[PDB]
Amino acid sequence: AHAEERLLKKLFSGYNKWSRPVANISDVVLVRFGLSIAQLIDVDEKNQMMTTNVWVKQEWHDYKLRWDPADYENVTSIRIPSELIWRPDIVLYNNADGDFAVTHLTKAHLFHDGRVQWTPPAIYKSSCSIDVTFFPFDQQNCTMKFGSWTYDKAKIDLV
């Protein structure tokens, strides 16, 4: 516990969550985006919405949150609140009756080589055009559009 206290004191001694975490300006923060669906809550044909319960699996590299575990009693990884670190602002473009960005803000896993894994839940009510030509034998094709809202390709790229 004292080792982790020391590590936390060191890491956030001069951390600035409002700055992109790249040692060099020309670099690109490579975010490995991916979804894991928990349940398809509902498909409102009348209102043309789709409610889903997904885990947004974002992973990126932060160059300031690095340490050598040997000094800190072999603490390879810690869990810290996600509100204390810079996070990509991935939003759901085609939103309808919902929230654009994740609002749960679970704790983000942080490793000793600067890696960060953040997997918060979210209920997304996206819009999707419904085709009812062959109802009730119809097959729907509803899409979700996720992307960074303010960092262009040269700054953040989704993998």
Ligand X SMILES: *[C@@H]1O[C@H](CO)[C@@H](O)[C@H](O)[C@H]1NC(C)=O
Residue stretches of the annotated binding site for Ca(2+): 43, 45
**Residues 75-78: contacts with CB under 8 Å, at least 24 apart:** 75/3, 75/4, 75/7, 75/112, 76/111, 76/112, 77/109, 77/110, 77/111, 77/112, 78/4, 78/7, 78/8, 78/110
CA dist 108 and 132 (Å) reads 42
Residue 104 binds to other proteins (criterion: CB under 8 A): no
Does 63 sit near ligand ACH (CB under 6 A)?
no
Its sign, for the CA torsion 61, 67, 70, 73, is negative
Please classify residue 109 by burial: count the beta carbons closer than 10 Å to its beta carbon, then call 0-12 exposed, 13-18 middle and 19+ buried.
Answer: middle
Question: Toward ligand X, which CB reaches closer, 74 or 129?
Answer: 129
**Contact between 129 and ligand X per CB under 6 A:** no
Output 141 or 150, the one with its CB closest to ligand X. Answer: 141
**141 contacts ligand X (rule: CB under 6 A):** yes
Single-letter amino acid code for the residue at 149: W
Q: How far is the CB of 46 from Ca ion (least distance, A)?
A: 8
Q: Does 94 bind ligand X (CB under 6 A)?
A: no
Query: Looking only at residues 26 through 85 of this chain, which bind other proteins when binding is defined by CB under 8 A?
Result: 47, 73-74, 79-81
Window 16-75: residues binding ligand X (CB under 6 A):
24, 26
The DSSP 8-state label assigned to residue 94 in this structure reads S
Omega of the bond prior to 136 within 30 degrees of 0, cis? Answer: yes
Contact status: 100 vs ligand ACH (CB under 6 A): no
Residue 3: how many other CB atoms lie within 10 Å: 14
Contact set with other proteins (CB under 8 A): 1, 4-5, 8, 16, 18-20, 22-25, 47, 73-74, 79-81, 89, 91, 93-101, 127, 149-151
Contact set with ligand ACH (CB under 6 A): 149-150
Contact set with ligand X (CB under 6 A): 24, 26, 141, 143
